[PDB]
Structure 1
Amino acid sequence: NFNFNGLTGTGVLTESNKKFLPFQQFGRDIADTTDAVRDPQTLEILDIT
């Protein structure tokens, strides 16, 4: 179970190869579900599966 800034859900976290622009916080999928999130306390970008 993951919770980033209140964005809460369940899934497996992994390191992401997506190149988020510096102002982007999460990547939204076709089904309007967050498939990628920035770690709030780091520059790290993680992919949700």
Structure 2
Amino acid sequence: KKFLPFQQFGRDIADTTDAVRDPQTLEILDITPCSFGGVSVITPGTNTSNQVAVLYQGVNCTEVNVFQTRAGCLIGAEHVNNSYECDIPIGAGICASYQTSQSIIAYTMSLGAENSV
């Protein structure tokens, strides 16, 4: 972005600043909040096992067995090619389950057994 000579700051639609001008050097650098999201714990029944996976929602696998899905970064979950009925919905077509030795896994959920008439 190009600032007019008297313009110094940049106000976002909520009074937060997206862009700015430094006193020491006049070069203008835009500002973005570091990162934020929602930590979710994918677990089976504690009666069954105590292994867990942690999904950092809506973020990459850099800011945080680190499969990177569209829901966010999945840590601790094994990626399995096989599809199954959705047991724990994660999002964006990804569901998790606890299956056999036993561990939690993440897969693209199956919409049902295919058929043809």
TM range (shorter): 0.5 to 0.7
Instruction: For 1:37 and 1:23, locate their aligned partners in 2 and report how far apart those are by CA, in whole Å.
Output: 12
Cα RMSD between the aligned structures? 0.7
Alignment TM-score, normalising by the size of structure 1: 0.59
**Aligned equivalents of 1:40, 1:24: Cα separation in 2:** 12
Aligned counterpart, 2:23? 40
Identical-residue share of aligned pairs (%): 100
What are the ranges of 5 or more consecutive residues in structure 1 without an aligned counterpart? Answer: 1-17
Higher gyration radius (CA): 2
Q: 4+ residue runs of structure 1 moved beyond 2 angstroms?
A: none
Which residue type is aligned with residue 25 of structure 1?
Answer: Q
**1:45 and 1:32 mapped to 2: Cα distance?**
18
Instruction: Report the AA paired with residue 42 of structure 1.
Output: T
Higher strand share: 1
Structure 2 unmatched ranges of 5 or more: 33-117
In structure 1, distance between residues paired with 2:30 and 2:17: 9
Deviation at 1:25, TM superposition (A): 0.9
